[PDB]
A paper describes a structure:
KCCs are important for K+ and Cl- homeostasis, including in establishing low neuronal cytoplasmic Cl- concentrations critical for inhibitory neurotransmission, and in volume regulation in many cell types. Among KCCs, KCC4 is most strongly activated by cell swelling and high internal [Cl-] and is uniquely active in acidic external environments. KCCs cotransport K+:Cl- in a 1:1 ratio, NKCCs cotransport 1K+:1Na+:2Cl-, and NCCs cotransport 1Na+:1Cl-. Here we report the structure of Mus musculus KCC4 in lipid nanodiscs determined by cryo-EM.
Author numbering: 117 to 652
Protein backbone atom coordinates (compact mmCIF):
# COMPACT_ATOMS: atom_id res chain seq x y z
CA UNK A 1 0.00 0.00 0.00
CA UNK A 2 1.30 3.42 -1.04
CA UNK A 3 0.08 6.92 -0.33
CA UNK A 4 -0.19 10.22 -2.20
CA UNK A 5 3.37 11.29 -3.03
CA UNK A 6 4.98 8.10 -4.34
CA UNK A 7 1.62 6.72 -5.43
CA UNK A 8 0.59 9.45 -7.86
CA UNK A 9 2.65 12.62 -7.87
CA UNK A 10 5.99 11.10 -8.82
CA UNK A 11 4.92 8.95 -11.84
CA UNK A 12 3.17 11.96 -13.37
CA UNK A 13 6.30 14.09 -13.00
CA UNK A 14 8.30 11.16 -14.38
CA UNK A 15 6.41 10.60 -17.62
CA UNK A 16 5.33 14.20 -18.28
CA UNK A 17 8.84 15.68 -18.24
CA UNK A 18 10.78 14.33 -21.22
CA UNK A 19 12.69 15.09 -24.38
CA UNK A 20 11.02 18.32 -25.53
CA UNK A 21 12.06 20.58 -22.64
CA UNK A 22 15.71 19.68 -23.26
CA UNK A 23 15.80 19.49 -27.06
CA UNK A 24 13.17 21.74 -28.64
CA UNK A 25 11.91 24.28 -26.08
CA UNK A 26 14.78 26.65 -26.78
CA UNK A 27 14.26 26.36 -30.54
CA UNK A 28 10.54 27.01 -30.03
CA UNK A 29 11.21 30.12 -27.92
CA UNK A 30 13.61 31.17 -30.65
CA UNK A 31 11.46 30.65 -33.74
CA UNK A 32 8.39 32.24 -32.18
CA UNK A 33 8.62 34.93 -29.52
CA UNK A 34 8.05 34.81 -25.80
CA UNK A 35 4.43 35.89 -26.34
CA UNK A 36 3.55 33.28 -28.97
CA UNK A 37 5.24 30.52 -26.97
CA UNK A 38 3.41 31.75 -23.86
CA UNK A 39 0.10 31.41 -25.71
CA UNK A 40 1.10 27.94 -26.94
CA UNK A 41 1.94 26.67 -23.46
CA UNK A 42 -1.20 28.27 -22.01
CA UNK A 43 -3.35 26.37 -24.51
CA UNK A 44 -1.54 23.05 -24.10
CA UNK A 45 -1.72 23.31 -20.31
CA UNK A 46 -5.36 24.42 -20.22
CA UNK A 47 -6.56 21.42 -22.24
CA UNK A 48 -4.63 19.03 -20.00
CA UNK A 49 -5.89 20.73 -16.83
CA UNK A 50 -9.53 20.51 -17.92
CA UNK A 51 -9.07 16.89 -18.98
CA UNK A 52 -7.47 16.19 -15.60
CA UNK A 53 -10.47 17.67 -13.79
CA UNK A 54 -12.84 15.51 -15.84
CA UNK A 55 -10.71 12.41 -15.25
CA UNK A 56 -10.67 13.19 -11.53
CA UNK A 57 -14.47 13.30 -11.61
CA UNK A 58 -14.32 9.85 -13.21
CA UNK A 59 -11.88 8.71 -10.52
CA UNK A 60 -14.14 9.84 -7.68
CA UNK A 61 -17.39 8.54 -9.21
CA UNK A 62 -18.35 5.30 -7.51
CA UNK A 63 -16.19 2.43 -6.32
CA UNK A 64 -13.11 2.68 -8.56
CA UNK A 65 -11.88 -0.80 -9.54
CA UNK A 66 -8.28 -1.87 -9.09
CA UNK A 67 -5.89 -1.91 -12.02
CA UNK A 68 -4.91 0.50 -14.76
CA UNK A 69 -6.58 3.60 -16.14
CA UNK A 70 -8.47 1.52 -18.70
CA UNK A 71 -10.48 -0.26 -15.99
CA UNK A 72 -11.47 3.07 -14.41
CA UNK A 73 -12.42 4.62 -17.75
CA UNK A 74 -14.34 1.55 -18.93
CA UNK A 75 -16.25 1.01 -15.69
CA UNK A 76 -17.20 4.67 -15.30
CA UNK A 77 -17.99 5.45 -18.94
CA UNK A 78 -19.58 3.19 -21.52
CA UNK A 79 -17.82 0.12 -22.91
CA UNK A 80 -17.57 1.55 -26.43
CA UNK A 81 -15.86 4.66 -25.04
CA UNK A 82 -13.51 2.31 -23.21
CA UNK A 83 -12.36 0.66 -26.42
CA UNK A 84 -11.92 3.91 -28.36
CA UNK A 85 -10.06 5.66 -25.54
CA UNK A 86 -7.93 2.56 -25.00
CA UNK A 87 -6.99 2.32 -28.67
CA UNK A 88 -6.12 6.02 -28.85
CA UNK A 89 -4.04 5.98 -25.67
CA UNK A 90 -2.31 2.77 -26.78
CA UNK A 91 -1.26 4.26 -30.12
CA UNK A 92 -0.20 7.39 -28.27
CA UNK A 93 1.98 5.41 -25.88
CA UNK A 94 3.72 3.45 -28.63
CA UNK A 95 4.39 6.50 -30.83
CA UNK A 96 5.61 8.33 -27.72
CA UNK A 97 8.03 5.46 -27.18
CA UNK A 98 9.18 5.88 -30.77
CA UNK A 99 9.74 9.61 -30.22
CA UNK A 100 11.56 9.01 -26.93
CA UNK A 101 14.03 6.51 -28.36
CA UNK A 102 14.48 8.84 -31.34
CA UNK A 103 15.45 11.57 -28.89
CA UNK A 104 17.88 9.21 -27.15
CA UNK A 105 19.53 8.36 -30.46
CA UNK A 106 19.65 12.03 -31.47
CA UNK A 107 21.45 12.90 -28.23
CA UNK A 108 23.90 10.03 -28.66
CA UNK A 109 24.65 10.76 -32.32
CA UNK A 110 24.82 14.56 -32.21
CA UNK A 111 26.17 15.64 -28.83
CA UNK A 112 28.16 12.84 -27.18
CA UNK A 113 29.86 10.89 -29.99
CA UNK A 114 30.09 12.85 -33.26
CA UNK A 115 32.95 10.55 -34.33
CA UNK A 116 30.46 7.73 -34.90
CA UNK A 117 27.43 6.94 -37.09
CA UNK A 118 29.21 5.31 -40.04
CA UNK A 119 26.25 5.64 -42.42
CA UNK A 120 27.24 8.97 -43.95
CA UNK A 121 28.02 10.51 -47.34
CA UNK A 122 30.50 13.19 -48.40
CA UNK A 123 28.34 15.72 -50.28
CA UNK A 124 26.57 18.98 -49.44
CA UNK A 125 23.13 17.38 -49.72
CA UNK A 126 24.59 13.95 -48.97
CA UNK A 127 24.61 14.68 -45.24
CA UNK A 128 20.99 15.85 -45.30
CA UNK A 129 20.00 12.69 -47.18
CA UNK A 130 22.13 10.32 -45.07
CA UNK A 131 21.19 11.61 -41.61
CA UNK A 132 17.77 10.00 -42.02
CA UNK A 133 19.23 6.61 -42.97
CA UNK A 134 21.76 6.75 -40.14
CA UNK A 135 19.08 7.61 -37.60
CA UNK A 136 16.91 4.83 -39.06
CA UNK A 137 19.54 2.13 -38.62
CA UNK A 138 20.40 3.29 -35.11
CA UNK A 139 16.68 3.40 -34.38
CA UNK A 140 16.14 -0.19 -35.48
CA UNK A 141 19.10 -1.25 -33.33
CA UNK A 142 17.89 0.65 -30.27
CA UNK A 143 14.30 -0.56 -30.61
CA UNK A 144 15.43 -4.18 -30.89
CA UNK A 145 17.66 -3.88 -27.83
CA UNK A 146 14.86 -2.13 -25.92
CA UNK A 147 12.29 -4.82 -26.70
CA UNK A 148 14.81 -7.53 -25.78
CA UNK A 149 15.63 -5.99 -22.41
CA UNK A 150 11.96 -5.29 -21.60
CA UNK A 151 11.16 -8.91 -22.49
CA UNK A 152 13.61 -10.29 -19.89
CA UNK A 153 14.44 -7.79 -17.16
CA UNK A 154 11.00 -6.48 -16.18
CA UNK A 155 12.04 -6.62 -12.52
CA UNK A 156 15.00 -4.33 -13.27
CA UNK A 157 13.23 -1.32 -14.75
CA UNK A 158 10.74 -0.65 -11.94
CA UNK A 159 13.58 -0.20 -9.47
CA UNK A 160 15.32 2.03 -12.05
CA UNK A 161 12.41 4.45 -12.47
CA UNK A 162 13.61 6.10 -9.26
CA UNK A 163 17.03 6.69 -10.84
CA UNK A 164 15.46 8.05 -14.03
CA UNK A 165 13.29 10.52 -12.13
CA UNK A 166 16.19 11.57 -9.89
CA UNK A 167 18.28 12.22 -13.00
CA UNK A 168 15.64 14.40 -14.64
CA UNK A 169 14.92 16.42 -11.50
CA UNK A 170 18.66 16.96 -11.04
CA UNK A 171 18.78 18.23 -14.63
CA UNK A 172 16.01 20.73 -13.88
CA UNK A 173 17.80 21.77 -10.69
CA UNK A 174 21.00 22.37 -12.66
CA UNK A 175 19.18 24.51 -15.22
CA UNK A 176 17.68 26.66 -12.46
CA UNK A 177 21.05 26.89 -10.71
CA UNK A 178 22.61 28.19 -13.91
CA UNK A 179 19.82 30.65 -14.67
CA UNK A 180 20.08 32.05 -11.14
CA UNK A 181 23.89 32.19 -10.99
CA UNK A 182 24.10 33.96 -14.36
CA UNK A 183 23.00 37.20 -12.68
CA UNK A 184 26.44 37.84 -11.12
CA UNK A 185 29.04 36.32 -13.48
CA UNK A 186 27.70 35.30 -16.89
CA UNK A 187 29.78 32.83 -18.90
CA UNK A 188 32.08 33.84 -21.74
CA UNK A 189 30.30 32.24 -24.70
CA UNK A 190 31.54 33.55 -28.08
CA UNK A 191 29.38 33.67 -31.22
CA UNK A 192 30.89 35.06 -34.43
CA UNK A 193 29.03 36.67 -37.30
CA UNK A 194 29.40 38.71 -40.48
CA UNK A 195 26.32 40.84 -39.83
CA UNK A 196 22.95 39.42 -40.81
CA UNK A 197 24.64 35.99 -41.02
CA UNK A 198 26.30 34.02 -38.21
CA UNK A 199 28.94 31.32 -38.50
CA UNK A 200 29.08 27.77 -37.14
CA UNK A 201 32.38 27.55 -35.25
CA UNK A 202 32.85 23.79 -35.30
CA UNK A 203 36.33 24.03 -36.80
CA UNK A 204 38.01 27.40 -36.35
CA UNK A 205 39.01 29.53 -33.37
CA UNK A 206 39.80 33.25 -32.92
CA UNK A 207 37.16 34.38 -35.43
CA UNK A 208 38.92 37.72 -36.04
CA UNK A 209 39.74 38.48 -39.66
CA UNK A 210 42.79 38.01 -41.87
CA UNK A 211 45.73 38.52 -39.51
CA UNK A 212 45.83 37.38 -35.93
CA UNK A 213 49.27 38.54 -34.89
CA UNK A 214 51.51 35.51 -34.75
CA UNK A 215 53.95 37.52 -36.83
CA UNK A 216 51.32 39.83 -38.36
CA UNK A 217 50.98 38.54 -41.94
CA UNK A 218 49.41 35.07 -41.74
CA UNK A 219 45.88 34.23 -42.83
CA UNK A 220 43.20 33.26 -40.32
CA UNK A 221 41.93 29.67 -40.25
CA UNK A 222 38.51 31.14 -40.99
CA UNK A 223 40.00 33.05 -43.93
CA UNK A 224 41.20 29.84 -45.59
CA UNK A 225 37.77 28.27 -45.13
CA UNK A 226 36.01 30.96 -47.16
CA UNK A 227 38.81 31.77 -49.61
CA UNK A 228 40.02 29.56 -52.45
CA UNK A 229 43.67 29.88 -51.45
CA UNK A 230 45.69 30.60 -48.32
CA UNK A 231 46.94 33.92 -49.65
CA UNK A 232 45.75 37.51 -49.86
CA UNK A 233 43.39 38.22 -52.72
CA UNK A 234 42.96 34.51 -53.50
CA UNK A 235 39.54 35.03 -55.17
CA UNK A 236 37.64 34.97 -51.88
CA UNK A 237 33.86 35.17 -51.73
CA UNK A 238 32.49 38.62 -52.52
CA UNK A 239 30.23 38.62 -49.46
CA UNK A 240 33.31 37.98 -47.33
CA UNK A 241 35.09 41.00 -48.82
CA UNK A 242 32.02 43.25 -48.60
CA UNK A 243 31.02 42.58 -44.98
CA UNK A 244 33.09 42.63 -41.81
CA UNK A 245 33.54 39.99 -39.13
CA UNK A 246 32.66 40.53 -35.48
CA UNK A 247 32.05 38.55 -32.30
CA UNK A 248 28.90 38.85 -30.19
CA UNK A 249 28.59 37.73 -26.58
CA UNK A 250 26.30 34.73 -26.58
CA UNK A 251 24.24 34.07 -23.46
CA UNK A 252 24.49 37.46 -21.72
CA UNK A 253 23.34 37.60 -18.13
CA UNK A 254 19.70 38.22 -17.40
CA UNK A 255 19.66 42.00 -17.16
CA UNK A 256 17.41 44.16 -19.35
CA UNK A 257 19.39 43.50 -22.53
CA UNK A 258 17.78 40.74 -24.56
CA UNK A 259 14.19 40.46 -23.29
CA UNK A 260 13.07 43.25 -25.60
CA UNK A 261 15.10 41.64 -28.39
CA UNK A 262 13.59 38.14 -28.16
CA UNK A 263 10.05 39.43 -27.74
CA UNK A 264 8.35 39.00 -31.12
CA UNK A 265 8.34 36.04 -33.50
CA UNK A 266 10.49 35.64 -36.61
CA UNK A 267 9.09 32.66 -38.58
CA UNK A 268 12.04 32.04 -40.86
CA UNK A 269 11.88 29.88 -43.97
CA UNK A 270 13.77 26.66 -44.74
CA UNK A 271 17.34 27.04 -45.94
CA UNK A 272 17.80 30.67 -44.91
CA UNK A 273 20.63 31.89 -42.73
CA UNK A 274 20.05 32.66 -39.07
CA UNK A 275 20.16 36.43 -38.71
CA UNK A 276 20.73 38.94 -35.92
CA UNK A 277 18.78 42.20 -36.03
CA UNK A 278 20.45 45.55 -35.47
CA UNK A 279 23.87 44.88 -36.95
CA UNK A 280 24.74 46.53 -40.26
CA UNK A 281 25.09 44.33 -43.34
CA UNK A 282 25.44 45.42 -46.97
CA UNK A 283 23.90 43.11 -49.60
CA UNK A 284 25.33 41.49 -52.74
CA UNK A 285 22.34 40.24 -54.82
CA UNK A 286 24.08 38.02 -57.40
CA UNK A 287 25.04 34.81 -55.56
CA UNK A 288 24.03 32.73 -52.55
CA UNK A 289 26.40 29.70 -52.43
CA UNK A 290 25.15 28.06 -49.19
CA UNK A 291 26.52 24.54 -49.67
CA UNK A 292 30.05 24.30 -48.31
CA UNK A 293 30.24 27.59 -46.45
CA UNK A 294 30.23 27.45 -42.62
CA UNK A 295 26.96 29.39 -42.34
CA UNK A 296 24.40 27.83 -40.04
CA UNK A 297 21.35 26.98 -42.14
CA UNK A 298 17.87 26.46 -40.77
CA UNK A 299 15.84 23.28 -40.41
CA UNK A 300 12.29 22.85 -41.80
CA UNK A 301 10.32 26.06 -42.24
CA UNK A 302 8.82 27.50 -39.07
CA UNK A 303 5.33 28.97 -39.06
CA UNK A 304 2.86 29.05 -36.18
CA UNK A 305 0.55 26.04 -35.58
CA UNK A 306 3.55 23.87 -36.37
CA UNK A 307 5.15 24.68 -33.03
CA UNK A 308 1.94 23.44 -31.39
CA UNK A 309 2.45 20.00 -32.92
CA UNK A 310 6.12 20.07 -31.98
CA UNK A 311 5.50 21.15 -28.40
CA UNK A 312 2.41 19.23 -27.29
CA UNK A 313 4.15 15.93 -26.23
CA UNK A 314 5.86 18.00 -23.54
CA UNK A 315 2.62 18.34 -21.56
CA UNK A 316 1.03 14.92 -22.07
CA UNK A 317 1.27 11.77 -20.01
CA UNK A 318 -1.30 12.38 -17.27
CA UNK A 319 -2.83 8.90 -17.35
CA UNK A 320 0.14 7.68 -15.28
CA UNK A 321 -1.20 8.75 -11.88
CA UNK A 322 -4.38 6.83 -12.66
CA UNK A 323 -2.22 3.80 -13.50
CA UNK A 324 -1.51 2.37 -10.02
CA UNK A 325 -5.00 2.95 -8.62
CA UNK A 326 -5.16 -0.59 -7.25
CA UNK A 327 -2.32 -0.14 -4.76
CA UNK A 328 -3.35 3.26 -3.40
CA UNK A 329 -4.96 4.14 -0.07
CA UNK A 330 -8.17 6.13 -0.61
CA UNK A 331 -7.52 6.57 -4.32
CA UNK A 332 -10.55 8.87 -4.67
CA UNK A 333 -8.67 11.34 -2.46
CA UNK A 334 -5.14 10.72 -3.74
CA UNK A 335 -5.75 10.94 -7.50
CA UNK A 336 -7.58 14.30 -7.94
CA UNK A 337 -5.05 16.16 -5.78
CA UNK A 338 -1.89 14.50 -7.05
CA UNK A 339 -2.71 14.75 -10.75
CA UNK A 340 -3.73 18.41 -10.63
CA UNK A 341 -0.75 19.39 -8.49
CA UNK A 342 1.48 17.56 -10.98
CA UNK A 343 0.06 19.54 -13.89
CA UNK A 344 0.45 22.77 -11.90
CA UNK A 345 4.09 21.88 -11.17
CA UNK A 346 5.00 21.08 -14.77
CA UNK A 347 3.17 24.13 -16.11
CA UNK A 348 5.06 26.31 -13.64
CA UNK A 349 8.32 24.69 -14.78
CA UNK A 350 7.58 25.34 -18.45
CA UNK A 351 6.43 28.94 -17.95
CA UNK A 352 9.47 29.75 -15.82
CA UNK A 353 11.82 28.12 -18.34
CA UNK A 354 10.26 30.10 -21.19
CA UNK A 355 10.41 33.46 -19.42
CA UNK A 356 14.03 32.76 -18.54
CA UNK A 357 15.07 31.49 -21.98
CA UNK A 358 13.65 34.68 -23.42
CA UNK A 359 15.73 36.76 -21.02
CA UNK A 360 19.11 34.98 -20.94
CA UNK A 361 19.98 33.30 -24.24
CA UNK A 362 20.63 35.45 -27.30
CA UNK A 363 17.97 35.28 -30.01
CA UNK A 364 20.49 34.17 -32.63
CA UNK A 365 21.67 31.39 -30.31
CA UNK A 366 18.08 30.28 -29.72
CA UNK A 367 17.41 29.40 -33.37
CA UNK A 368 20.39 27.02 -33.51
CA UNK A 369 18.63 23.78 -32.32
CA UNK A 370 21.86 21.83 -32.90
CA UNK A 371 24.40 23.97 -31.08
CA UNK A 372 26.20 24.56 -34.38
CA UNK A 373 27.14 28.05 -33.17
CA UNK A 374 28.24 27.08 -29.63
CA UNK A 375 31.23 24.94 -30.69
CA UNK A 376 28.92 21.95 -31.20
CA UNK A 377 27.53 21.91 -27.64
CA UNK A 378 24.04 21.96 -26.15
CA UNK A 379 22.50 25.40 -25.65
CA UNK A 380 20.33 24.47 -22.67
CA UNK A 381 23.37 22.55 -21.41
CA UNK A 382 25.59 25.58 -21.86
CA UNK A 383 23.04 27.44 -19.73
CA UNK A 384 23.52 25.10 -16.75
CA UNK A 385 25.81 25.98 -13.85
CA UNK A 386 28.41 23.19 -13.31
CA UNK A 387 28.99 21.86 -16.85
CA UNK A 388 26.88 20.94 -19.91
CA UNK A 389 27.96 17.32 -19.36
CA UNK A 390 25.29 16.85 -16.70
CA UNK A 391 22.37 17.90 -18.90
CA UNK A 392 23.30 15.70 -21.86
CA UNK A 393 23.64 12.53 -19.77
CA UNK A 394 20.60 13.53 -17.74
CA UNK A 395 18.41 13.86 -20.82
CA UNK A 396 19.93 10.63 -22.17
CA UNK A 397 19.05 8.59 -19.08
CA UNK A 398 15.63 10.18 -18.61
CA UNK A 399 14.61 9.69 -22.25
CA UNK A 400 15.83 6.08 -22.35
CA UNK A 401 13.91 5.42 -19.14
CA UNK A 402 10.74 7.00 -20.50
CA UNK A 403 11.08 4.84 -23.61
CA UNK A 404 11.42 1.72 -21.46
CA UNK A 405 8.37 2.81 -19.47
CA UNK A 406 6.31 3.27 -22.63
CA UNK A 407 7.37 -0.10 -24.03
CA UNK A 408 6.44 -1.66 -20.69
CA UNK A 409 3.06 0.03 -20.34
CA UNK A 410 1.67 -0.12 -23.88
CA UNK A 411 1.66 -3.95 -24.31
CA UNK A 412 0.03 -4.47 -20.90
CA UNK A 413 -2.69 -2.00 -21.86
CA UNK A 414 -3.20 -3.69 -25.23
CA UNK A 415 -3.46 -7.03 -23.43
CA UNK A 416 -6.03 -5.60 -21.02
CA UNK A 417 -8.06 -4.36 -23.99
CA UNK A 418 -7.80 -7.70 -25.78
CA UNK A 419 -8.86 -9.79 -22.76
CA UNK A 420 -12.22 -8.06 -22.94
CA UNK A 421 -14.15 -9.27 -25.97
CA UNK A 422 -14.88 -5.73 -27.08
CA UNK A 423 -12.70 -6.35 -30.14
CA UNK A 424 -13.41 -9.85 -31.51
CA UNK A 425 -11.04 -9.34 -34.44
CA UNK A 426 -8.07 -8.91 -32.07
CA UNK A 427 -8.56 -11.57 -29.39
CA UNK A 428 -5.26 -13.27 -30.26
CA UNK A 429 -3.29 -10.76 -28.17
CA UNK A 430 -4.49 -12.26 -24.89
CA UNK A 431 -1.88 -14.97 -24.52
CA UNK A 432 0.79 -14.14 -21.98
CA UNK A 433 3.72 -15.65 -20.14
CA UNK A 434 3.03 -17.72 -17.03
CA UNK A 435 4.53 -14.94 -14.91
CA UNK A 436 1.72 -12.68 -16.15
CA UNK A 437 3.25 -10.15 -18.58
CA UNK A 438 2.09 -9.95 -22.22
CA UNK A 439 4.15 -11.55 -24.98
CA UNK A 440 2.17 -11.53 -28.22
CA UNK A 441 1.12 -7.89 -27.91
CA UNK A 442 4.77 -6.90 -27.49
CA UNK A 443 5.45 -7.94 -31.09
CA UNK A 444 2.71 -5.66 -32.40
CA UNK A 445 3.85 -2.78 -30.19
CA UNK A 446 7.44 -3.07 -31.40
CA UNK A 447 6.23 -3.26 -35.00
CA UNK A 448 4.04 -0.15 -34.72
CA UNK A 449 6.87 1.68 -32.95
CA UNK A 450 9.20 0.67 -35.79
CA UNK A 451 6.68 2.01 -38.31
CA UNK A 452 6.86 5.24 -36.35
CA UNK A 453 10.64 5.27 -36.12
CA UNK A 454 11.09 4.81 -39.89
CA UNK A 455 9.88 8.38 -40.35
CA UNK A 456 13.12 9.16 -38.48
CA UNK A 457 12.32 12.82 -37.78
CA UNK A 458 11.50 14.10 -34.30
CA UNK A 459 9.89 17.16 -35.91
CA UNK A 460 7.38 15.11 -37.94
CA UNK A 461 6.68 12.18 -35.63
CA UNK A 462 5.52 14.52 -32.81
CA UNK A 463 2.35 15.74 -34.62
CA UNK A 464 1.10 12.15 -34.97
CA UNK A 465 1.50 11.63 -31.22
CA UNK A 466 -0.16 15.00 -30.63
CA UNK A 467 -3.18 14.14 -32.77
CA UNK A 468 -3.64 10.76 -31.07
CA UNK A 469 -3.49 12.19 -27.55
CA UNK A 470 -5.77 15.08 -28.53
CA UNK A 471 -8.33 12.60 -29.85
CA UNK A 472 -8.15 10.59 -26.62
CA UNK A 473 -8.57 13.66 -24.42
CA UNK A 474 -11.43 14.96 -26.57
CA UNK A 475 -13.20 11.61 -26.27
CA UNK A 476 -12.82 11.58 -22.48
CA UNK A 477 -14.12 15.15 -22.17
CA UNK A 478 -17.07 14.51 -24.50
CA UNK A 479 -17.88 11.29 -22.64
CA UNK A 480 -18.01 12.98 -19.24
CA UNK A 481 -19.97 15.93 -20.64
CA UNK A 482 -22.65 13.90 -22.40
CA UNK A 483 -22.77 11.46 -19.47
CA UNK A 484 -23.65 14.14 -16.93
CA UNK A 485 -25.74 15.91 -19.56
CA UNK A 486 -28.07 12.99 -20.35
CA UNK A 487 -28.18 12.28 -16.56
CA UNK A 488 -27.30 8.63 -17.11
CA UNK A 489 -28.73 6.12 -14.58
CA UNK A 490 -25.24 5.53 -13.13
CA UNK A 491 -23.21 8.76 -13.09
CA UNK A 492 -22.71 10.07 -9.56
CA UNK A 493 -19.47 12.08 -9.45
CA UNK A 494 -18.44 13.29 -5.99
CA UNK A 495 -15.75 15.77 -7.02
CA UNK A 496 -16.55 19.23 -5.70
CA UNK A 497 -15.22 21.50 -8.46
CA UNK A 498 -16.67 19.82 -11.54
CA UNK A 499 -19.24 21.30 -13.91
CA UNK A 500 -20.94 20.00 -17.01
CA UNK A 501 -19.60 23.03 -18.89
CA UNK A 502 -15.99 22.66 -17.76
CA UNK A 503 -15.44 19.34 -19.52
CA UNK A 504 -17.33 20.79 -22.50
CA UNK A 505 -14.92 23.72 -22.59
CA UNK A 506 -11.96 21.35 -22.49
CA UNK A 507 -13.48 19.28 -25.29
CA UNK A 508 -13.96 22.34 -27.50
CA UNK A 509 -10.52 23.68 -26.57
CA UNK A 510 -8.42 20.73 -27.66
CA UNK A 511 -10.82 20.23 -30.53
CA UNK A 512 -9.60 23.64 -31.68
CA UNK A 513 -6.05 22.52 -30.90
CA UNK A 514 -6.49 19.46 -33.12
CA UNK A 515 -8.07 21.55 -35.89
CA UNK A 516 -5.19 24.06 -35.64
CA UNK A 517 -2.41 21.45 -35.52
CA UNK A 518 -3.23 19.51 -38.69
CA UNK A 519 -6.63 19.41 -40.37
CA UNK A 520 -5.88 16.87 -43.12
CA UNK A 521 -5.14 14.21 -40.52
CA UNK A 522 -8.10 15.51 -38.50
CA UNK A 523 -10.65 14.75 -41.23
CA UNK A 524 -9.89 11.04 -41.54
CA UNK A 525 -9.11 10.78 -37.82
CA UNK A 526 -12.59 11.99 -36.86
CA UNK A 527 -13.99 9.88 -39.71
CA UNK A 528 -12.55 6.60 -38.41
CA UNK A 529 -13.08 7.70 -34.80
CA UNK A 530 -16.81 7.73 -35.43
CA UNK A 531 -16.51 4.54 -37.48
CA UNK A 532 -14.84 2.53 -34.71
CA UNK A 533 -17.47 3.90 -32.32
CA UNK A 534 -20.51 2.44 -34.10
CA UNK A 535 -19.00 -1.03 -34.56
CA UNK A 536 -19.30 -2.02 -30.89
C1 LIG B 1 34.31 46.67 -39.70
O1 LIG B 1 34.26 47.02 -38.33
C2 LIG B 1 34.52 48.41 -38.12
C3 LIG B 1 34.35 48.67 -36.64
O2 LIG B 1 35.60 48.69 -35.98
C4 LIG B 1 33.59 49.26 -38.99
O3 LIG B 1 34.34 49.89 -40.02
C5 LIG B 1 34.33 51.10 -39.38
O4 LIG B 1 33.48 51.82 -40.24
C6 LIG B 1 33.36 53.21 -39.90
C7 LIG B 1 32.32 53.80 -40.83
O5 LIG B 1 32.78 53.80 -42.17
C8 LIG B 1 34.72 53.89 -40.02
O6 LIG B 1 34.61 55.24 -39.59
C9 LIG B 1 34.85 56.40 -40.28
O7 LIG B 1 36.17 56.35 -39.79
C10 LIG B 1 37.04 57.33 -40.38
C11 LIG B 1 38.45 57.05 -39.90
O8 LIG B 1 39.26 58.16 -40.24
C12 LIG B 1 36.53 58.72 -39.98
O9 LIG B 1 37.38 59.71 -40.53
C13 LIG B 1 35.08 58.91 -40.48
O10 LIG B 1 34.58 60.16 -40.05
C14 LIG B 1 34.17 57.76 -40.04
O11 LIG B 1 33.90 57.95 -38.66
C15 LIG B 1 35.75 53.16 -39.17
O12 LIG B 1 37.05 53.69 -39.41
C16 LIG B 1 35.75 51.66 -39.47
N1 LIG B 1 36.64 50.96 -38.56
C17 LIG B 1 37.54 50.04 -38.95
C18 LIG B 1 37.62 49.77 -40.42
O13 LIG B 1 38.27 49.47 -38.15
C19 LIG B 1 32.49 48.41 -39.62
O14 LIG B 1 31.62 47.91 -38.61
C20 LIG B 1 33.07 47.24 -40.42
N2 LIG B 1 33.39 47.64 -41.77
C21 LIG B 1 32.60 47.43 -42.83
C22 LIG B 1 31.30 46.72 -42.56
O15 LIG B 1 32.91 47.79 -43.96
C1 LIG C 1 19.62 41.05 -43.18
O1 LIG C 1 20.36 41.78 -44.17
C2 LIG C 1 19.80 41.74 -45.49
C3 LIG C 1 20.85 42.28 -46.43
O2 LIG C 1 20.64 43.66 -46.69
C4 LIG C 1 18.51 42.55 -45.51
O3 LIG C 1 17.56 41.94 -46.38
C5 LIG C 1 16.37 42.60 -46.55
O4 LIG C 1 15.25 41.76 -46.22
C6 LIG C 1 13.97 42.33 -46.54
C7 LIG C 1 12.93 41.35 -46.04
O5 LIG C 1 13.21 40.03 -46.49
C8 LIG C 1 13.89 42.58 -48.04
O6 LIG C 1 12.63 43.17 -48.37
C9 LIG C 1 11.66 42.92 -49.31
O7 LIG C 1 12.48 42.71 -50.45
C10 LIG C 1 11.77 42.39 -51.65
C11 LIG C 1 12.79 42.05 -52.72
O8 LIG C 1 12.37 42.63 -53.95
C12 LIG C 1 10.93 43.61 -52.01
O9 LIG C 1 10.26 43.37 -53.24
C13 LIG C 1 9.91 43.87 -50.89
O10 LIG C 1 9.12 45.01 -51.21
C14 LIG C 1 10.60 44.03 -49.52
O11 LIG C 1 11.19 45.32 -49.51
C15 LIG C 1 15.03 43.48 -48.48
O12 LIG C 1 15.01 43.64 -49.90
C16 LIG C 1 16.37 42.89 -48.06
N1 LIG C 1 17.46 43.79 -48.41
C17 LIG C 1 18.55 43.41 -49.08
C18 LIG C 1 18.62 41.96 -49.48
O13 LIG C 1 19.44 44.20 -49.36
C19 LIG C 1 17.92 42.65 -44.11
O14 LIG C 1 18.53 43.72 -43.40
C20 LIG C 1 18.12 41.36 -43.32
N2 LIG C 1 17.41 40.26 -43.96
C21 LIG C 1 16.20 39.83 -43.59
C22 LIG C 1 15.57 40.53 -42.42
O15 LIG C 1 15.64 38.90 -44.16
CL1 LIG D 1 -1.98 11.25 -20.62
K1 LIG E 1 5.46 13.60 -21.85
Amino acid sequence: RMGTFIGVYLPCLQNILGVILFLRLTWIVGAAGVMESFLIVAMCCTCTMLTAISMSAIATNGVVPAGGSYYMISRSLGPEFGGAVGLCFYLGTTFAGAMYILGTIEIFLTYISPSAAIFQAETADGEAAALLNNMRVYGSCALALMAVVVFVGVKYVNKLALVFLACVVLSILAIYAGVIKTAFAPPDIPVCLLGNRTLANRNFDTCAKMQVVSNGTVTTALWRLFCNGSSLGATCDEYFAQNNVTEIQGIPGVASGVFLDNLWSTYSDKGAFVEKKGVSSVPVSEESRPGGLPYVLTDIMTYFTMLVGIYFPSVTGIMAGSNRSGDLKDAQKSIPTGTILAIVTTSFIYLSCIVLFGACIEGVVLRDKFGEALQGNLVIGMLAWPSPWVIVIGSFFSTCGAGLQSLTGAPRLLQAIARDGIIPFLQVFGHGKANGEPTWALLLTALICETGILIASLDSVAPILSMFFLMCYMFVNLACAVQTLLRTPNWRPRFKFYHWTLSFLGMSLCLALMFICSWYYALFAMLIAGCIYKYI
